[PDB]
Protein backbone atom coordinates (compact mmCIF):
# COMPACT_ATOMS: atom_id res chain seq x y z
CA UNK A 1 0.00 0.00 0.00
CA UNK A 2 2.61 2.95 0.56
CA UNK A 3 4.33 1.74 -2.53
CA UNK A 4 0.96 2.18 -4.16
CA UNK A 5 0.64 5.60 -2.52
CA UNK A 6 4.42 6.55 -3.68
CA UNK A 7 3.56 5.77 -7.17
CA UNK A 8 0.40 7.85 -7.51
CA UNK A 9 1.87 10.53 -6.00
CA UNK A 10 4.29 10.73 -8.32
CA UNK A 11 1.90 10.19 -11.19
CA UNK A 12 0.27 13.17 -9.92
CA UNK A 13 2.95 15.26 -10.00
CA UNK A 14 3.86 14.22 -13.74
CA UNK A 15 0.06 15.23 -14.27
CA UNK A 16 0.26 18.33 -12.95
CA UNK A 17 1.61 19.82 -16.10
CA UNK A 18 1.56 23.82 -15.00
CA UNK A 19 2.94 22.48 -11.41
CA UNK A 20 0.54 24.21 -9.23
CA UNK A 21 -0.39 21.71 -6.90
CA UNK A 22 -3.63 21.20 -8.27
CA UNK A 23 -5.40 19.21 -11.12
CA UNK A 24 -7.51 21.69 -13.14
CA UNK A 25 -10.14 20.64 -15.75
CA UNK A 26 -7.48 21.58 -18.88
CA UNK A 27 -4.86 18.85 -17.02
CA UNK A 28 -7.57 16.57 -15.48
CA UNK A 29 -9.15 15.87 -18.80
CA UNK A 30 -5.81 14.95 -20.11
CA UNK A 31 -5.08 12.59 -17.87
CA UNK A 32 -8.61 10.90 -18.38
CA UNK A 33 -8.19 10.65 -21.67
CA UNK A 34 -4.62 8.81 -22.23
CA UNK A 35 -6.08 6.61 -19.17
CA UNK A 36 -9.99 5.96 -19.78
CA UNK A 37 -9.62 6.70 -23.78
CA UNK A 38 -12.46 9.39 -23.40
CA UNK A 39 -12.62 12.47 -20.99
CA UNK A 40 -15.75 13.10 -18.55
CA UNK A 41 -18.63 15.77 -19.39
CA UNK A 42 -17.67 19.30 -18.21
CA UNK A 43 -20.00 19.64 -15.26
CA UNK A 44 -19.97 15.57 -14.71
CA UNK A 45 -16.20 16.22 -14.15
CA UNK A 46 -17.89 18.94 -11.30
CA UNK A 47 -20.00 16.19 -9.81
CA UNK A 48 -17.13 14.16 -9.30
CA UNK A 49 -15.72 17.26 -7.60
CA UNK A 50 -18.81 17.66 -5.44
CA UNK A 51 -18.10 13.68 -4.19
CA UNK A 52 -14.61 15.03 -3.24
CA UNK A 53 -15.75 17.87 -1.05
CA UNK A 54 -18.41 16.22 0.68
CA UNK A 55 -15.45 13.84 2.10
CA UNK A 56 -12.17 15.85 2.71
CA UNK A 57 -12.14 19.48 2.60
CA UNK A 58 -8.37 19.81 1.19
CA UNK A 59 -9.46 17.68 -1.56
CA UNK A 60 -10.42 20.57 -3.98
CA UNK A 61 -9.07 23.91 -4.61
CA UNK A 62 -9.77 26.15 -7.03
CA UNK A 63 -11.66 23.85 -9.29
CA UNK A 64 -9.03 21.28 -9.61
CA UNK A 65 -8.09 18.38 -7.98
CA UNK A 66 -5.09 18.08 -5.23
CA UNK A 67 -3.25 15.47 -4.34
CA UNK A 68 -5.28 14.48 -0.92
CA UNK A 69 -8.11 14.75 -3.21
CA UNK A 70 -6.32 12.51 -6.20
CA UNK A 71 -5.56 10.28 -3.49
CA UNK A 72 -9.10 10.21 -2.07
CA UNK A 73 -10.24 8.46 -5.32
CA UNK A 74 -7.88 5.71 -5.38
CA UNK A 75 -9.63 4.56 -2.61
CA UNK A 76 -12.75 5.61 -3.33
CA UNK A 77 -12.55 3.34 -6.12
CA UNK A 78 -11.62 0.24 -4.14
CA UNK A 79 -14.00 0.31 -1.45
CA UNK A 80 -10.03 -2.77 -8.31
CA UNK A 81 -8.81 -1.90 -11.96
CA UNK A 82 -9.50 1.41 -12.27
CA UNK A 83 -6.28 1.92 -10.37
CA UNK A 84 -4.44 -0.70 -12.55
CA UNK A 85 -5.23 1.10 -15.79
CA UNK A 86 -3.82 4.13 -14.45
CA UNK A 87 -0.65 2.89 -13.23
CA UNK A 88 0.01 0.76 -16.06
CA UNK A 89 -0.66 3.91 -18.56
CA UNK A 90 2.28 5.39 -16.29
CA UNK A 91 4.75 2.04 -16.98
CA UNK A 92 4.39 1.15 -13.86
CA UNK A 93 4.34 -2.63 -13.16
CA UNK A 94 3.00 -5.47 -10.76
CA UNK A 95 5.42 -4.77 -8.22
CA UNK A 96 4.73 -0.92 -8.30
CA UNK A 97 7.69 -0.17 -10.10
CA UNK A 98 8.89 1.39 -13.80
CA UNK A 99 9.20 -1.47 -16.36
CA UNK A 100 12.83 -1.81 -18.34
CA UNK A 101 10.41 -1.62 -21.39
CA UNK A 102 9.45 2.13 -20.14
CA UNK A 103 12.98 3.43 -18.81
CA UNK A 104 15.40 1.63 -20.96
CA UNK A 105 13.94 1.54 -24.98
CA UNK A 106 16.90 -0.26 -27.01
CA UNK A 107 18.15 2.69 -29.49
CA UNK A 108 21.40 0.96 -30.66
CA UNK A 109 23.87 3.83 -32.14
CA UNK A 110 25.81 3.10 -34.87
CA UNK A 111 29.41 3.25 -35.31
CA UNK A 112 31.04 6.99 -35.25
CA UNK A 113 27.75 8.48 -34.90
CA UNK A 114 26.61 10.56 -32.39
CA UNK A 115 23.35 11.56 -30.57
CA UNK A 116 21.00 14.63 -30.10
CA UNK A 117 18.11 16.15 -28.65
CA UNK A 118 15.44 17.21 -31.64
CA UNK A 119 13.40 20.25 -31.57
CA UNK A 120 10.36 19.13 -29.85
CA UNK A 121 12.50 17.65 -27.10
CA UNK A 122 14.11 20.81 -26.38
CA UNK A 123 11.00 22.51 -26.32
CA UNK A 124 9.65 19.67 -24.02
CA UNK A 125 12.59 20.71 -21.53
CA UNK A 126 11.74 24.39 -21.62
CA UNK A 127 8.22 23.92 -20.49
CA UNK A 128 9.92 21.61 -17.84
CA UNK A 129 12.27 24.53 -16.82
CA UNK A 130 9.64 26.72 -16.46
CA UNK A 131 7.57 24.83 -14.66
CA UNK A 132 9.92 24.62 -11.78
CA UNK A 133 11.34 28.14 -11.79
CA UNK A 134 8.75 29.66 -9.72
CA UNK A 135 10.79 32.37 -8.76
CA UNK A 136 10.94 33.20 -12.76
CA UNK A 137 14.85 33.94 -11.89
CA UNK A 138 15.78 31.90 -15.15
CA UNK A 139 18.00 29.42 -12.89
CA UNK A 140 16.84 26.70 -10.47
CA UNK A 141 17.88 27.06 -6.90
CA UNK A 142 18.78 23.98 -4.77
CA UNK A 143 15.08 24.30 -3.92
CA UNK A 144 13.92 24.23 -7.12
CA UNK A 145 16.16 21.32 -8.26
CA UNK A 146 14.81 18.97 -5.24
CA UNK A 147 11.11 20.15 -6.86
CA UNK A 148 12.28 18.80 -10.45
CA UNK A 149 13.84 15.60 -9.15
CA UNK A 150 10.68 14.85 -6.88
CA UNK A 151 9.37 12.40 -9.64
CA UNK A 152 12.94 10.67 -9.11
CA UNK A 153 13.56 7.95 -7.30
CA UNK A 154 17.53 9.13 -6.92
CA UNK A 155 19.05 12.42 -7.20
CA UNK A 156 20.43 12.35 -10.99
CA UNK A 157 22.76 15.62 -10.97
CA UNK A 158 25.68 16.30 -8.63
CA UNK A 159 27.29 19.26 -7.49
CA UNK A 160 29.94 19.05 -10.03
CA UNK A 161 27.10 19.59 -12.72
CA UNK A 162 27.28 23.13 -11.68
CA UNK A 163 30.97 23.43 -12.93
CA UNK A 164 29.97 21.50 -16.25
CA UNK A 165 27.46 24.14 -17.86
CA UNK A 166 26.26 27.77 -17.55
CA UNK A 167 25.60 28.91 -14.00
CA UNK A 168 24.50 32.42 -12.37
CA UNK A 169 25.32 34.69 -10.13
CA UNK A 170 25.15 31.99 -7.17
CA UNK A 171 26.28 28.92 -8.62
CA UNK A 172 22.69 27.97 -9.71
CA UNK A 173 22.03 26.30 -12.86
CA UNK A 174 20.75 28.66 -15.80
CA UNK A 175 18.08 28.67 -18.05
CA UNK A 176 20.98 28.03 -21.17
CA UNK A 177 22.81 25.99 -18.78
CA UNK A 178 20.12 23.45 -18.12
CA UNK A 179 19.71 22.64 -21.52
CA UNK A 180 23.32 21.93 -21.72
CA UNK A 181 23.64 19.72 -19.25
CA UNK A 182 20.67 17.40 -21.32
CA UNK A 183 22.54 18.19 -24.60
CA UNK A 184 25.63 16.90 -22.80
CA UNK A 185 23.70 13.67 -20.85
CA UNK A 186 22.35 12.79 -24.39
CA UNK A 187 25.84 13.00 -26.25
CA UNK A 188 27.71 11.18 -23.68
CA UNK A 189 24.98 8.86 -22.33
CA UNK A 190 21.99 8.82 -23.69
CA UNK A 191 20.19 5.38 -21.80
CA UNK A 192 20.93 7.54 -19.28
CA UNK A 193 18.69 10.69 -21.03
CA UNK A 194 16.11 8.74 -22.18
CA UNK A 195 15.98 6.77 -18.56
CA UNK A 196 15.78 10.69 -16.65
CA UNK A 197 13.31 11.25 -19.79
CA UNK A 198 11.35 8.32 -18.77
CA UNK A 199 11.05 10.03 -14.79
CA UNK A 200 9.96 13.82 -16.07
CA UNK A 201 6.90 11.37 -18.04
CA UNK A 202 8.27 12.58 -21.29
CA UNK A 203 6.65 9.58 -23.60
CA UNK A 204 3.19 10.34 -21.92
CA UNK A 205 3.19 13.99 -21.74
CA UNK A 206 3.69 14.41 -25.24
CA UNK A 207 1.88 10.76 -26.54
CA UNK A 208 4.60 8.63 -27.99
CA UNK A 209 5.62 5.47 -28.69
CA UNK A 210 8.86 5.77 -25.91
CA UNK A 211 11.33 8.22 -25.16
CA UNK A 212 13.85 7.29 -27.51
CA UNK A 213 11.47 9.43 -29.92
CA UNK A 214 13.43 12.26 -28.47
CA UNK A 215 16.54 11.47 -30.00
CA UNK A 216 18.30 12.15 -32.98
CA UNK A 217 21.08 10.24 -34.51
CA UNK A 218 23.60 11.89 -36.42
CA UNK A 219 24.55 10.07 -39.95
CA UNK A 220 28.31 8.49 -40.25
CA UNK A 221 31.31 10.58 -39.38
CA UNK A 222 33.36 9.60 -42.16
CA UNK A 223 30.12 10.57 -44.68
CA UNK A 224 30.38 14.04 -43.43
CA UNK A 225 34.32 14.33 -43.94
CA UNK A 226 33.20 12.91 -47.62
CA UNK A 227 30.50 15.29 -48.70
CA UNK A 228 32.72 17.98 -46.43
CA UNK A 229 29.66 18.64 -45.02
CA UNK A 230 27.67 18.10 -41.54
CA UNK A 231 23.74 18.66 -40.10
CA UNK A 232 25.09 18.15 -36.67
CA UNK A 233 24.77 20.78 -33.50
CA UNK A 234 26.95 19.27 -30.93
CA UNK A 235 30.90 19.23 -31.55
CA UNK A 236 33.49 17.78 -29.29
CA UNK A 237 36.55 18.56 -28.58
CA UNK A 238 39.14 16.92 -26.41
CA UNK A 239 41.72 19.38 -24.36
CA UNK A 240 45.38 17.50 -24.14
CA UNK A 241 48.17 18.80 -22.15
CA UNK A 242 50.57 17.99 -19.05
CA UNK A 243 49.19 18.34 -15.77
CA UNK A 244 48.66 21.76 -14.53
CA UNK A 245 49.04 23.58 -17.83
CA UNK A 246 45.51 25.10 -17.82
CA UNK A 247 43.10 22.88 -19.36
CA UNK A 248 40.14 23.26 -16.46
CA UNK A 249 40.77 26.69 -16.74
CA UNK A 250 40.12 26.62 -20.70
CA UNK A 251 37.08 24.46 -19.65
CA UNK A 252 35.77 26.91 -17.26
CA UNK A 253 36.18 29.69 -19.25
CA UNK A 254 33.72 28.75 -21.95
CA UNK A 255 31.08 28.81 -19.05
CA UNK A 256 31.95 32.26 -18.59
CA UNK A 257 34.44 31.77 -15.24
CA UNK A 258 37.04 34.18 -14.60
CA UNK A 259 40.70 32.72 -13.01
CA UNK A 260 39.73 34.11 -9.90
CA UNK A 261 36.26 32.91 -9.93
CA UNK A 262 37.61 29.15 -10.20
CA UNK A 263 39.91 29.57 -7.63
CA UNK A 264 36.54 29.41 -5.63
CA UNK A 265 35.78 26.00 -6.70
CA UNK A 266 35.73 23.05 -4.54
CA UNK A 267 37.80 19.99 -5.55
CA UNK A 268 34.81 17.76 -4.41
CA UNK A 269 33.05 19.50 -6.95
CA UNK A 270 35.43 19.48 -9.68
CA UNK A 271 34.25 18.55 -13.77
CA UNK A 272 36.15 17.20 -16.68
CA UNK A 273 33.38 18.61 -18.43
CA UNK A 274 32.49 21.81 -20.15
CA UNK A 275 29.44 22.36 -22.70
CA UNK A 276 28.07 25.57 -23.86
CA UNK A 277 26.75 27.34 -27.08
CA UNK A 278 28.82 29.01 -29.81
CA UNK A 279 27.97 30.92 -32.69
CA UNK A 280 29.92 29.94 -35.98
CA UNK A 281 29.45 32.39 -38.75
CA UNK A 282 25.73 33.15 -37.50
CA UNK A 283 25.48 29.14 -36.57
CA UNK A 284 24.36 28.39 -33.15
CA UNK A 285 26.29 25.24 -32.13
CA UNK A 286 27.29 23.09 -28.85
CA UNK A 287 30.19 23.20 -28.16
CA UNK A 288 31.66 20.24 -25.31
CA UNK A 289 34.77 19.84 -23.89
CA UNK A 290 36.32 16.99 -22.32
CA UNK A 291 39.53 17.57 -19.99
CA UNK A 292 42.25 14.50 -20.71
CA UNK A 293 44.18 14.23 -17.80
CA UNK A 294 47.71 13.22 -18.07
CA UNK A 295 47.94 9.43 -17.65
CA UNK A 296 50.50 6.81 -19.10
CA UNK A 297 47.87 5.90 -21.94
CA UNK A 298 45.87 7.29 -24.71
CA UNK A 299 43.12 4.88 -25.66
CA UNK A 300 41.06 4.87 -28.63
CA UNK A 301 38.54 6.69 -26.36
CA UNK A 302 40.39 9.81 -25.87
CA UNK A 303 40.58 10.90 -28.94
CA UNK A 304 37.46 10.32 -30.28
CA UNK A 305 36.36 13.69 -31.08
CA UNK A 306 35.36 16.38 -34.03
CA UNK A 307 38.50 18.64 -32.83
CA UNK A 308 41.37 18.71 -30.82
CA UNK A 309 42.67 21.39 -28.10
CA UNK A 310 46.14 20.90 -27.53
CA UNK A 311 47.38 23.36 -24.65
CA UNK A 312 50.62 23.95 -22.98
CA UNK A 313 51.40 26.76 -20.67
CA UNK A 314 53.79 29.45 -21.75
CA UNK A 315 55.41 29.83 -18.03
CA UNK A 316 56.39 25.86 -18.36
CA UNK A 317 59.80 25.17 -20.58
CA UNK A 318 58.66 21.84 -20.80
CA UNK A 319 54.78 21.48 -21.80
CA UNK A 320 54.77 22.12 -25.32
CA UNK A 321 57.09 18.68 -25.82
CA UNK A 322 54.24 16.90 -24.61
CA UNK A 323 51.48 18.62 -27.43
CA UNK A 324 54.48 17.56 -29.59
CA UNK A 325 54.67 14.36 -28.53
CA UNK A 326 50.99 13.40 -28.20
CA UNK A 327 50.07 15.16 -31.53
CA UNK A 328 52.90 13.23 -33.67
CA UNK A 329 51.64 9.26 -31.96
CA UNK A 330 47.91 9.76 -32.29
CA UNK A 331 46.99 12.98 -34.52
CA UNK A 332 49.90 13.35 -37.34
CA UNK A 333 48.49 11.58 -39.80
CA UNK A 334 44.37 11.65 -38.46
CA UNK A 335 41.21 13.94 -39.96
CA UNK A 336 40.98 15.51 -36.60
CA UNK A 337 42.19 19.00 -37.10
CA UNK A 338 44.39 20.46 -34.16
CA UNK A 339 44.68 23.49 -32.65
CA UNK A 340 47.87 24.48 -29.74
CA UNK A 341 46.59 26.97 -27.30
CA UNK A 342 48.90 28.84 -25.50
CA UNK A 343 47.62 28.86 -22.37
CA UNK A 344 48.28 31.63 -19.03
CA UNK A 345 49.57 33.95 -21.83
CA UNK A 346 48.87 36.44 -18.96
CA UNK A 347 52.42 35.09 -17.32
CA UNK A 348 55.85 36.24 -18.81
CA UNK A 349 56.36 33.88 -21.42
CA UNK A 350 59.60 31.39 -21.61
CA UNK A 351 61.21 29.74 -23.93
CA UNK A 352 59.92 26.26 -24.65
CA UNK A 353 62.66 23.52 -24.32
CA UNK A 354 61.22 21.36 -27.66
CA UNK A 355 63.37 20.91 -30.14
CA UNK A 356 61.27 23.57 -32.59
CA UNK A 357 59.36 26.53 -31.75
CA UNK A 358 55.55 26.14 -31.41
CA UNK A 359 55.12 28.23 -34.25
CA UNK A 360 57.21 26.75 -36.64
CA UNK A 361 55.96 23.47 -35.65
CA UNK A 362 52.64 24.48 -36.71
CA UNK A 363 54.12 25.05 -40.26
CA UNK A 364 55.94 21.79 -40.44
CA UNK A 365 52.49 19.89 -39.65
CA UNK A 366 49.78 22.24 -41.24
CA UNK A 367 48.33 23.43 -38.02
CA UNK A 368 47.39 27.39 -37.50
CA UNK A 369 49.54 29.44 -35.33
CA UNK A 370 49.36 28.50 -31.77
CA UNK A 371 46.45 30.64 -30.15
CA UNK A 372 47.36 33.16 -27.03
CA UNK A 373 44.72 32.68 -24.41
CA UNK A 374 43.95 33.46 -21.02
CA UNK A 375 41.23 33.13 -18.37
CA UNK A 376 43.02 35.60 -15.94
CA UNK A 377 41.59 38.94 -17.23
CA UNK A 378 38.61 41.73 -15.50
CA UNK A 379 35.40 40.22 -16.61
CA UNK A 380 34.96 36.90 -18.69
CA UNK A 381 37.34 35.32 -20.81
CA UNK A 382 37.62 35.38 -24.70
CA UNK A 383 35.64 32.83 -26.53
CA UNK A 384 37.65 33.42 -29.39
CA UNK A 385 39.18 29.95 -29.13
CA UNK A 386 36.10 28.05 -28.58
CA UNK A 387 34.58 29.78 -31.84
CA UNK A 388 38.24 28.51 -33.51
CA UNK A 389 36.92 25.12 -32.28
CA UNK A 390 33.54 25.02 -33.34
CA UNK A 391 34.63 26.40 -36.35
CA UNK A 392 37.25 23.40 -37.46
CA UNK A 393 35.01 21.02 -36.06
CA UNK A 394 32.36 21.68 -38.70
CA UNK A 395 34.58 22.31 -41.27
CA UNK A 396 37.87 20.49 -40.98
CA UNK A 397 38.80 21.08 -44.90
CA UNK A 398 38.17 25.21 -44.77
N1 LIG B 1 48.06 33.37 -14.28
C1 LIG B 1 47.31 32.32 -14.69
N2 LIG B 1 47.26 31.22 -13.93
C2 LIG B 1 46.48 30.28 -14.48
C3 LIG B 1 45.74 30.37 -15.75
N3 LIG B 1 45.07 29.24 -15.97
C4 LIG B 1 45.38 28.47 -14.89
N4 LIG B 1 46.21 29.06 -14.01
C5 LIG B 1 46.70 28.42 -12.76
O1 LIG B 1 47.45 27.28 -13.14
C6 LIG B 1 47.22 26.19 -12.25
C7 LIG B 1 46.72 24.99 -13.06
O2 LIG B 1 45.50 25.27 -13.73
P1 LIG B 1 44.40 24.12 -14.00
O3 LIG B 1 43.40 24.66 -14.97
O4 LIG B 1 43.95 23.55 -12.69
O5 LIG B 1 45.32 23.03 -14.75
P2 LIG B 1 44.97 21.53 -15.23
O6 LIG B 1 45.86 21.18 -16.38
O7 LIG B 1 43.48 21.43 -15.40
C8 LIG B 1 45.44 20.53 -13.79
P3 LIG B 1 45.17 18.77 -14.14
O8 LIG B 1 46.14 18.39 -15.22
O9 LIG B 1 45.43 18.05 -12.86
O10 LIG B 1 43.74 18.64 -14.59
C9 LIG B 1 46.28 26.72 -11.18
O11 LIG B 1 47.02 27.16 -10.03
C10 LIG B 1 45.58 27.89 -11.87
O12 LIG B 1 45.13 28.90 -10.96
C11 LIG B 1 45.86 31.65 -16.50
O13 LIG B 1 45.33 31.97 -17.59
N5 LIG B 1 46.66 32.51 -15.86
CL1 LIG C 1 6.06 7.57 -15.39
MG1 LIG D 1 -2.09 22.01 -12.37
MG1 LIG E 1 14.43 29.85 -10.18
Given at each position: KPACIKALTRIFKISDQDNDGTLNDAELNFFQRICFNTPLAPQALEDVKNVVRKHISDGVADS??????????????????????????????????LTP???????????????????????????????????????????????????????????????????????????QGFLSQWTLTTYLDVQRCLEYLGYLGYSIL????????????????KIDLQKKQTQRNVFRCNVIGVKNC??????????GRNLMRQKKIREDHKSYYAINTVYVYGQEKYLLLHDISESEFLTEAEIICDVVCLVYDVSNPKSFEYCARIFKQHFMDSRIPCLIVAAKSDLHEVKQEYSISPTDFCRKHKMPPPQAFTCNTADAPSKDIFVKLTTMAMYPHV
Amino acid sequence: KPACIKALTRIFKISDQDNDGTLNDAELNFFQRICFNTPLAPQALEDVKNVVRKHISDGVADSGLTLKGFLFLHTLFIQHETTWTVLRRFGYDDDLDLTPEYLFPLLKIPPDCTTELNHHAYLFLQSTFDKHDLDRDCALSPDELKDLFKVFPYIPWGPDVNNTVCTNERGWITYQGFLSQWTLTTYLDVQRCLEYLGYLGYSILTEQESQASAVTVTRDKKIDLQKKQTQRNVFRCNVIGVKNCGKSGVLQALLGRNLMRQKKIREDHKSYYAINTVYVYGQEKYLLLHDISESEFLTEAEIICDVVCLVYDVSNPKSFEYCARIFKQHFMDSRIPCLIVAAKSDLHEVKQEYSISPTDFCRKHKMPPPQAFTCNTADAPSKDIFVKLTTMAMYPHV
